[PDB]
Structure formats: C-alpha cells, structure tokens
Amino acid sequence: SPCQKCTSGCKCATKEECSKTCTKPCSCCPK
Ligand SMILES: [Cd+2]
Ligand SMILES: [Cd+2]
Ligand SMILES: [Cd+2]
C-alpha cells in the first residue's frame, strides 16, 4: 500500500529515490 504521495504521484523511479518519499516498495515503487 502506497503512502499519500505515491497514489497519483509515485516519485520513486527506483529503490534509490524510494528512500526519499518512503522506505520500501509501496504498492507502486519497485519490487
Ligand atoms: Cd510511497
Ligand atoms: Cd517509494
Ligand atoms: Cd510508490
């Protein structure tokens, strides 16, 4: 489940940028 900024706004292109808006693969970032 993606946070409140990943819904229509997933900004993580990879787990590297994922450490910026989240800490793990929400339901949209990488696997
Ligand atoms: Cd997220
Ligand atoms: Cd993320
Ligand atoms: Cd995401």
22 is in an annotated binding site: yes
Question: Measured in angstroms, how far is the CA atom of residue 26 from the centroid of ligand 1?
Answer: 5
Structure tokens at 4: 């409140």
Question: 29, exposed or middle or buried, with CB in 10 Å at 0-12, 13-18, 19+?
Answer: buried
6-25 burial code (b ≥16 CB/10 A, e <16)? beeebebeeeeebeebbeee
CB 15 within 8 A of CB 22: no
Alpha-carbon Rg for the chain in angstroms: 8
Question: Measured in angstroms, how far is the CA atom of residue 21 from the centroid of ligand 1?
Answer: 6
Measured CA to CA, the distance from residue 3 to residue 9 in angstroms comes to 10
3 is in an annotated binding site: yes
23 is in an annotated binding site: no
Name the residue with tokens 């489940």. Answer: 1
Question: Measured in angstroms, how far is the CA atom of residue 19 from the centroid of ligand 3?
Answer: 11
CB 6 within 8 A of CB 21: yes
